[PDB]
Design a protein around this ligand. Structure first.
Ligand SMILES: Cc1cc(-n2cc(S(=O)(=O)C3COC3)c3ccc(N[C@@H](C)c4ccc(F)cn4)nc32)n[nH]1
Length: 279
């Protein structure tokens, strides 16, 4: 279940059956298939031939995943311009914006709870376990690349963008372990490190990692052994998962099966889930 497919296996949706509504972001439109709501990621008609294969390849990989914590590919419109990849619409939006906007505030407190954060972490960890089990390295696990099905209770978090893994088939230094940015070595353990950073992102409620450091400051900091402090109010058991994710040797980092169990232990400890979030 690697790249045992080609363009011909993609579901071509006739262009006249696709409607573009409103723009959602960049780096994509809300759309309609005739009925059915979709997201449409577009390839600018103004682009190089390298861009075109990059677009095509991303569609192929996303079409081949089958996992509940990975955004679904509905289909494609590659034979008309601009080319489209049609993807599952995620009304909860990107994980970064969700955390920043649902931060408990005086007017709306207890908006989010620790357990809700644990569930997002589990969801994304579950998707990463599937990628690792299928020998796929994401290379860019980060809150900005995760999506939520809806805002309220019952939200599901899914990995929803694969641009960086597609590129090596600028660099997000603040999410990369030493062996990645020093050697260009990528393994399933480099995603583990990134998951630790994402974990820090979740429990900080959408803070930028290493908040006062530049990329080079981080690179020197991480190489010399420096690690982030716990997010405000972060339970110890959760921070320990982050710190085990940031072990210097990849071989000393947990795989995603182990991370999931550890998040679940966190999920069934009252001192963890009864910890109040900062407002
Ligand atoms: C593939 C997909 C995307 C998506 N989507 C749904 C909304 S939204 O629900 O309209 C939100 C507006 O306020 C509520 C949304 C907003 C921004 C966004 N950015 C794009 C660049 C993106 C792509 C991948 C990724 F992981 C993160 N972001 N994508 C949004 N659904 N499905």
């Amino acid at each position: 279940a690697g790249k045992t497919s080609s363009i011909s296996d993609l579901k071509e949706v006739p262009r006249k059956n696709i409607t573009l509504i409103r723009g959602l972001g960049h780096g994509v439109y809300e759309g309609q298939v005739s009925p059915l709501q979709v997201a449409v990621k577009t390839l600018p008609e103004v682009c190089s031939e390298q861009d075109e294969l990059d677009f095509l390849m991303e569609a192929l990989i996303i079409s081949k995943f089958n996992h509940q914590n990975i955004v679904r590919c509905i289909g494609v419109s590659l034979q008309s311009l601009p080319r489209f990849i049609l993807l599952e619409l995620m009304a909860g939006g990107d994980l970064k914006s969700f955390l920043r906007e649902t931060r408990p505030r005086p007017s709306q407190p207890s908006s989010l709870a620790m357990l809700d954060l644990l569930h997002v972490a589990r969801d994304i960890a579950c998707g990463c376990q599937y990628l690792e089990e299928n020998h796929f390295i994401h290379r860019d696990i980060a809150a900005r690349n995760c999506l939520l099905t809806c805002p309220g209770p019952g939200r599901v978090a899914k990995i929803g963008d694969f641009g960086m893994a597609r590129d090596i088939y600028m660099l997000p230094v603040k999410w990369m372990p030493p062996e990645a940015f020093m050697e260009g070595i990528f393994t399933s353990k480099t995603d583990t490190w990134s998951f630790g950073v994402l974990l820090w992102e979740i429990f900080s409620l959408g803070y930028m990692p290493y908040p006062s450091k530049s990329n080079q400051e981080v690179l020197e900091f991480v190489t010399s052994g420096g690690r982030m402090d716990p997010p405000k109010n972060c339970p110890g058991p959760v921070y320990r998962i982050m710190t085990q994710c940031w072990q210097h040797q990849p071989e000393d980092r947990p795989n995603f099966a182990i991370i999931l169990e550890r998040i679940e232990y966190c999920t069934q400890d009252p001192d963890v889930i009864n910890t109040a979030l900062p407002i």
